[PDB]
């Protein structure tokens, strides 16, 4: 009868960069998505599978909560089927998605005056990521056919580029902390109620 991470995920310290999004098993516990939906500063609160506060009345087997950070033009991609830069090279939403996408600004903390490069994306990858896959591998990209044995240079680049986050950015280029609540429910014991 314990409550679900409430503040552990949303009201956290720092979010993971998007290429290495951490996923937390949100299970065996009653969730407070009833009254957290009403906080409402979020700049994109859209659940692509079920009703917002109605979902209390339906336990789920194993809610997965993935948390990372992007920008406003990147937010348009944390979506089922949308393949911009971020939903096919790091964190792709399955076409059969059923969960939530919560997005709020973050300038006040995730952007520092001088290039907070902690938060990164993948921009180069041999293949497009598969639904709900994490790639963190820092293998050099083999763009040129030539052998690039850990080499950083011509037609071979570090596959991780950092958002040069700064306060004075456009609202679209600004930081957004973003959490995706993959609601799953199947024969496995459903222990996420409300």
């Amino acid at each position: 009868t314990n409550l679900c991470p409430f503040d552990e995920v949303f009201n956290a310290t720092t979010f993971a960069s998007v290429y290495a999004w951490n996923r937390k098993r949100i299970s065996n516990c009653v969730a407070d998505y009833s009254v957290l939906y009403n906080f409402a500063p979020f700049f994109t609160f859209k659940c692509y599978g079920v009703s917002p506060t109605k979902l209390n009345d339906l336990c789920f087997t194993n809610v997965y909560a993935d948390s990372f950070v992007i920008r406003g033009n990147e937010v348009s991609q944390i979506a089922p089927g949308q393949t911009g830069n971020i939903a096919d090279y790091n964190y792709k939403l399955p076409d059969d998605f059923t969960g939530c996408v919560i997005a709020w600004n973050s300038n006040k903390l995730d952007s520092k005056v001088g290039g907070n490069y902690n938060y990164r994306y993948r921009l180069f990858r041999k293949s497009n990521l598969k639904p709900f896959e994490r790639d963190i591998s820092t293998e050099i990209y083999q763009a040129g056919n030539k052998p690039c044995n850990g080499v950083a240079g011509v037609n071979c680049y570090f596959p991780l580029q950092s958002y040069g986050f700064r306060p004075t950015y456009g609202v679209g280029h600004q930081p957004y902390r973003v959490v995706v609540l993959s609601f799953e429910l199947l024969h496995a014991p459903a222990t996420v109620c409300g």
């Binding site: 180069f124 763009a143 037609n155 040069g164 700064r166 004075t168 456009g170 609202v171 280029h173 600004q174």
Partner: protein
Amino acid sequence: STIEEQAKTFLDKFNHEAEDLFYQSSLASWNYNTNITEENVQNMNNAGDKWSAFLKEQSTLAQMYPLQEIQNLTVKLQLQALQQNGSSVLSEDKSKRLNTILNTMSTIYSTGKVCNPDNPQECLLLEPGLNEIMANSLDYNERLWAWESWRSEVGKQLRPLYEEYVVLKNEMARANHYEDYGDYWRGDYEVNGVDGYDYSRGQLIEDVEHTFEEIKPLYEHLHAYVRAKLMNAYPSYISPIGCLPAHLLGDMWGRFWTNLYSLTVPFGQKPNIDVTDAMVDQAWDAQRIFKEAEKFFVSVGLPNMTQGFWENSMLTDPGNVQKAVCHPTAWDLGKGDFRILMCTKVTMDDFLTAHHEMGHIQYDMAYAAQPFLLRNGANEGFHEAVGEIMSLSAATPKHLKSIGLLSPDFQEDNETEINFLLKQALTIVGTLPFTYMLEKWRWMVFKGEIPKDQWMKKWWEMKREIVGVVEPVPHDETYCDPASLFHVSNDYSFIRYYTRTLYQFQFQEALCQAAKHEGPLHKCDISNSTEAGQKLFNMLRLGKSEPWTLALENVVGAKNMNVRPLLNYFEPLFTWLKDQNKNSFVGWSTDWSPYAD
């Protein structure tokens, strides 16, 4: 695997690295331009230096993808831009010499001073001393002294430097497969490999001359009229058939005839329009000026300024503690950050300049979605033209009345509009033969058509023949009067102003047609006309991703530069000048001079 795919990936790496580094440089440059301190002089320099080095490294890297095996036109554009090495095609020795000469000439112009013949410790710079003389003084001898001493004290220093500059820049341009440095400059208007829109580097020459031929009547009548008025002001100096003396033209060079307005206003008693008093009477501050500019641009469908624009722009003189560079400028730092730097005064001049600079900002926000390398105007003449048509619309009485500054009981007549059109022609038409001739003299010197021993001799012939201006003192070849202007001794192509003048009136006419404007063109305001705004955004959103000819056709439906909108804007004053000159000689003889008696 292919060459174009690897080039696409190279440019993909480049754009992100470039956004970050260029934002660094722009922010340090802002830092400096708003908060003057030796410290962020050092920061501006170090940031711009890392940016310069990144560009040279990426240009060497870009020359490793040949354009010959690349088909995507837009990719080819970006790579050709990154591949223009420039002065790094010379030897390092010759590049250091060229840069040494450029810096020496620049600091000679900026630090060239003349001292009066009675006090060897009291001197004037060009700005502000001699400029204030040439812009305000009515005494003939004071003006003559200023003109001649600026061209002998500082021009004589610039002669040999300019000769070596010609040699090195011709080497630089021939080394990048242009016939000379002027052809290099004309390379800005070049369009290749798009059927129905191409444009060659000599075609610019031909169109400039062909359109100037059509301008010649309007200019001849303006010249004869200004001569009549000045000759009324200086009877014992100006001949009624001769050229105008160079040092009585309003500024140091006769670049603009605007300061002759006091001496040539047709109806010198009719009240001139200036809403400054009204802005002050209705408690307007700079906040209100820029809010009205934003309101104008919104009235036609464009977006309002970003919250960053209001949080970050410097729109007032920031007191006396910190000094700032108050030249009105529009800044696109990239990555969604747009600012304006202007020490705004509650005046009408600053009111119009605000709409001009916010037009720059609107252009920047339109093509913001383009790649880093294509975030610019169609050619060198598009930004300033866009900025000018905003002042054109917001200056009209219809707009001033619309926003509450001008009272509805203001009487537009056939005299006050002639005063207005005459000031406009003194600024706009007046600079056109000057610009054409200056860039033509440069183009010939670069092509090798004027021997050194005739440089100045040709210059003042061209002054007499094309512009209608005679020099008041004979100059042998110890002078370099071209270099005595800011733009010749600091390496900037000049034809951009000619082309900009023509572009801005093509724009204003097309927009006023889309806005269903009745009456003469100069009276037109494009406010509350979303269709004109859409027709303009269709070209603003392009940046330089399509040929400049295609961007122009998007607004005006025509693929080439054209003078007819200029002549249509100025046709009322044209006919008025034709009438006023019925008792005057129109044209000029080239052999009369104030020194040949």
